[PDB]
Symmetry: C3
């Protein structure tokens, strides 16, 4: 991909590769670290009290928050190696925008859906999956059909966002107030930050032209830290509060 | 992919791109529309009587018919954008024949297998998956090993077709006559149309040479409409008849 | 991929393609054959006595050993067609080292994990998946970041190997001595041979330079025969011994 004489001067690929490499490297360590904390604490037991799991194992699906973090962090390690190697390398996760997200965003929606017991888990998964594929297509397409792909993207996303809103709202009163606190912050992230991604696309170098490819890399690093690690920690703490109420103390869910 | 001077005149890629774009666009709307009807009716309740689901949710796997339709329709939107953009675009679902089917055909077999309660669901899934990958390989390979890939394809498909025949036949008498009617039409499609795909490959421009790449695109649009939408509607109506008998009226399956 | 004038003389791709084709072809037949035996015997019933399954079906997950074999054998058929066609063909499973393993190795770990009832099945799956992706990246990367990808690979693999060791050791005394015999050989393969793959990478033409690309193809054919077929047969016989004890004879697991 990289011209043997380096990227052209005025090229969108004429970036500060050392800085980009560095930023991915730190993001790699914090996101992966958060995942290790998540799996560790999950194994410790149920609730803050750390009541022993009857089976001696946590439920399989509780592992998704941590796994998503370890997977996102591993991709940030790859992304770093590409930047430090100057970009345009044979195995570049920095070349096809959104391809990495095809793997992590559908897992995030499942994690949220198992944690709250939302209906229509298969639908939510495919809604998210198709949305990210439209993004990928949108980014590689140089014609105006760029915006045909983007719109097709928005067609999937909008009914997904509104459906999820209604479903979370229905379950938000089932949980006790202590649980309700963590659920609030996770909703802020989901409904605050997920819309940021398509709004950013419009102002990028592929739309209006306000945001450079370099700034775009740095911004997605902050967004990935928030949408994976912090969200992950919020799901973990939400599940600890929930277990303390229902399992350690034996109380019942409003429902 | 597209030469800057357009496709050569005698080229297999010298096609009526406006017509192809148009045809994919209509197929996109009908297939996606059918899927929306499928998920809507599923949510309404069990049977024609629309008896409330006890849990308040349909079973997850009942969503596959509709999902398959929404996924196939979304790919027909992509295929349209590629044709209208003249073909050979960076994100072309019209370039690698059969790649799209790698995602939808294994889902169709699961849908049919959950609906009838066939054995060996994991086997059926991988049988179908491998068959379509052989097709993909067959299409990109320009040598005579084209027919080595095709044969390897047929090796997977033939024992799958015969195994399924036997398994459907065993379950066809379990169901009441009203159900038996819909099951018949779905079998016609599965055993009539699925064989059409490999028979078409032989007469294509990659075999004998009777069918042009353009005609081939138009024919697969009709086959996708039949194998996804109509099949989908037949599964839906079959499940409505079945639920009316077993759930609303409480009758028992012959079995 | 292949220069129209053939591969250069001193090229790593100047190989004995007839011999390579031949070797893949035999490996294809034995691995696929073993899989057919595996599914056949599974269908026969529970234990050596072949006690009828109550449901009339084997459990779905017992099919994985055979499926993995049929999938690996099918890829060896593809690999053969590529070698006989001289290499560098459009659908070459011989071009991107380790890509094929991305599909089979995570399935092997699930098969082993369902058979022994190991905890953390989702974690084990993703540990293996990410490791093989690091291999793929390592192989295509020509820079020294080759060894950054390899190390990242080893970061996933090492905690996986040690975790599995501890978990198998905990379950190895649950099973009766007759079962314990087969479990021993399967552990030899898993802990003997899986480490062979990264040790080979170091001595290859991409590391020190002791092992040629040709020898490397032949060695992986022997390793795939051992890690898929023989392992597969060991899992099958282990499950037959186990069922004879617990199901046919009704005895209890130490646990
Ligand atoms: C930052 C997000 C804010 C969440 C704070 C939740 C909180 O308040 O934490 C409390 C304790 O949670 C707990 O066990 C612990 C909560 C924090 C979990 C620790 C985060 C680990 C970060 C690892 C990064 C390492 C990088 C190398 C919950 O009861 P107050
Ligand atoms: C794409 C959709 C992904 C998730 C769809 C889903 O799971 O939502 C189902 C359909 O609701 C819905 O789409 C209804 C809400 C979203 C559709 C709104 C369209 C406005 C444009 C929920 O049905 P209920 O449980 O109410 O019965
Ligand atoms: C065409 C296939 C033939 C199937 C007809 C089944 C039938 O006979 O439909 C009846 C009613 O089914 C039902 O609820 C409804 C059956 C038909 C379902 C409606 C199809 C929706 C098409 C959406 C396309 C919109 C494009 C934008 C079944 O009891 P008779
Ligand atoms: C590829 C196979 C995909 C599905 C295989 C499967 O699920 O079929 C199983 C094997 O039957 C079979 O292949 C037997 C029928 C298909 C094989 C016929 C080979 C003829 C050439 C069914 O076993 P049963 O329930 O009778 O015990
Ligand atoms: C070689 C691995 C060694 C395992 C031998 C296990 C053994 O000892 O086999 C015995 C019987 O197992 C059984 O039913 C049969 C055990 C062997 C299974 C037969 C292997 C089939 C190979 C198919 C390859 C065909 C290629 C075309 C187990 O009780 P002893
Ligand atoms: C990557 C990890 C894949 C599998 C991880 C897993 O499933 O292992 C869990 C964590 O143990 C572990 O990693 C502990 C053993 C592996 C970590 C050792 C690190 C040394 C370097 C097991 O937890 P327990 O059941 O003891 O509670
Ligand atoms: C961890 C990364 C996350 C949560 C990413 C989410 C990304 C989106 C919600 C992206 C949405 C898009 C559209 C709605 C349409 C156009 C293309 C996208 C991918 C930017
Ligand atoms: C919705 C699309 C469907 C149901 C497609 C099915 C396609 C096949 C059954 C194709 C079969 C093939 C072979 C049996 C061998 C050669 C290659 C194929 C893919 C044409
Ligand atoms: C059937 C094939 C099997 C069991 C292959 C297993 C392969 C590995 C365990 C490979 C391991 C690697 C590393 C630990 C790091 C570097 C890259 C690999 C893929 C060679
Ligand atoms: C929905 C409307 C936005 C799509 C814009 C792309 C137009 C496609 C035609 C380009 C010539
Ligand atoms: C109570 C703390 C809430 C967590 C922080 C909210 C998420 C936004 C981070 C940027
Ligand atoms: C929904 C469809 C969105 C299409 C318009 C996006 C913004 C276009 C930016 C200007 C391009 C010059
Ligand atoms: C979200 C953060 C707001 C976007 C940052 C502005 C882009 C900076 C200019 C890059 C050229
Ligand atoms: C927090 C958001 C980070 C903003 C990134 C802007 C960098 C511009 C070069
Ligand atoms: C099964 C027979 C059909 C395969 C035909 C391809 C032959 C491969 C050799 C080409 C030279
Ligand atoms: C009773 C109606 C049956 C449905 C139609 C059969 C499928 C063939 C369509 C072309
Ligand atoms: C089963 C193997 C099928 C191989 C033959 C397919 C038809 C070949 C068409 C003629 C090619 C000139
Ligand atoms: C199934 C429909 C039958 C095939 C159609 C014949 C192909 C038309 C000729 C294209 C050149
Ligand atoms: C119904 C089948 C459609 C036949 C397509 C033939 C088109 C030839 C140009
Ligand atoms: C862990 C250490 C091994 C990694 C070796 C690759 C070094 C990357 C820098 C190359 C210049
Ligand atoms: C763990 C990191 C391994 C890095 C070193 C691998 C061997 C390098 C081979 C010599 C290369 C000339
Ligand atoms: C495992 C087998 C040991 C490796 C074989 C040595 C490589 C032969 C030399 C190739 C040039
Ligand atoms: C058994 C291992 C096979 C060794 C392969 C070495 C081949 C060298 C040419």
């Amino acid at each position: 991909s990289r011209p043997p004489e380096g990227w052209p001067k005025g090229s969108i690929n004429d970036m500060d590769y050392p800085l980009l490499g560095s930023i991915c490297a730190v993001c790699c360590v914090f996101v992966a670290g958060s995942g290790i904390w998540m799996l560790y604490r999950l194994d410790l037991g149920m609730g803050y009290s750390c009541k022993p799991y009857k089976s001696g194992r946590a439920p399989e699906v509780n592992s998704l928050s941590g796994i998503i973090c370890l997977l996102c962090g591993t991709m940030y390690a790859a992304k770093s190696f590409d930047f430090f190697d100057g970009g345009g390398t044979p195995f570049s996760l920095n070349w096809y925008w959104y391809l990495d997200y095809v793997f992590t965003c559908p897992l995030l929606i499942l994690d949220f859906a198992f944690t709250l017991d939302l209906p229509h888990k298969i639908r939510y998964f495919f809604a998210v999956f198709l949305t990210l594929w439209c993004g990928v297509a949108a980014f590689v397409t140089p014609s105006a059909y760029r915006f045909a792909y983007y719109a097709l993207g928005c067609c999937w996303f909008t009914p997904f966002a509104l459906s999820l809103m209604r479903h979370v709202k229905e379950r938000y009163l089932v949980y006790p107030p202590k649980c309700q606190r963590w659920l609030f912050w996770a909703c802020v992230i989901f409904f605050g930050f997920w819309p940021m991604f398509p709004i950013l696309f419009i102002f990028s170098w592929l739309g209006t032209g306000h945001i450079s490819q370099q700034a775009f890399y740095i911004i997605h690093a902050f967004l990935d830290l928030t949408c994976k690690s912090i969200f992950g920690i919020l799901m973990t703490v939400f599940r600890l509060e929930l277990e303390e109420h229902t399992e350690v103390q034996g109380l019942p869910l409003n429902e």
